[PDB]
């Protein structure tokens, strides 16, 4: 199966995330990818959990990229979660204008999956 | 009659879509606050 | 044939809407009586 932090980060589950990052293991588990390449910062924002992705940024998570080369802005833009890209832009304003392995930005990924309410916020 | 029944099914699919988004918020809330002891990994 | 298939889809959207309202009553009951200990604010 998957890690206890990768389980807690994608299903909301706030007090379990705060407790796993409180342990002695909770220093190198925060930046660990899975077989798809996603850190807990990727899966928390792909699923649109906006107060779990904030605690991962107060503890200083690194902005790595998965096997497709996407940052947490582009994964949340594919899913149309508007409140979690207004928070990631307020603390990292340089993830908006980035590309991936296929060269697509966040406006490219929000139109491939028909997310009209994000396009008005991405622009 | 075709234009007065296609217009009726458009209002019905809007009610199904709004009921299903209010329910998807609650199902997603349950897994955030569900108690997991025996089946914990 | 158009009037005998638009009439058939009207009875199908009525069954989806009634199944979804009976289920929305149960999902809304779960959060009223769910046990919340670990994930309590």
Descriptors:
part of a larger assembly, 123 residues, mainly alpha, 3 chains, Transient receptor potential cation channel subfamily A member 1 (chains B, C), globular
Account of the protein in words:
- The structure is cut from a larger assembly and holds three copies of chain A.
- With 123 residues, chain A is mainly alpha-helical.
- In chain A, 45% of the residues lie in helices and 0% in strands.
- Chain A has eight helices and no strands.
- Chain A has helices spanning 4-10, 14-20, 40-46, 53-58, 72-79, 85-91, 106-111, 116-122.
- Chain A is globular.
- At the B-C interface, helix 1 of B face helix 1 of C.
- Chain A: It is found in: Cell membrane.
- Chain A: ANK repeats lie at residues 1-29, 36-65, 68-98, 102-123.
Sketch the topology of chain A as an H/E string, one letter per element. HHHHHHHH
By DSSP (H or I, 4+ residues per run), the number of helices of chain A equals: 8
Structural class of chain A: mainly alpha
Rg estimate of chain A, integer Å: 14 Å
Helical proportion of chain A, percent range: 40-55%
- Overall body shape of chain A: globular
Q: What distance lies between the first and last C-alpha atoms of chain A, to the nearest angstrom?
A: 39 Å
- Oligomerization state of this entry? part of a larger assembly
How many individual β-strands of chain A?
A: 0
Protein name (chain A): Transient receptor potential cation channel subfamily A member 1
Subcellular location (chain A): Cell membrane
Subunit structure (chain A): Homotetramer.
Organism (chain A): Drosophila melanogaster (Fruit fly)
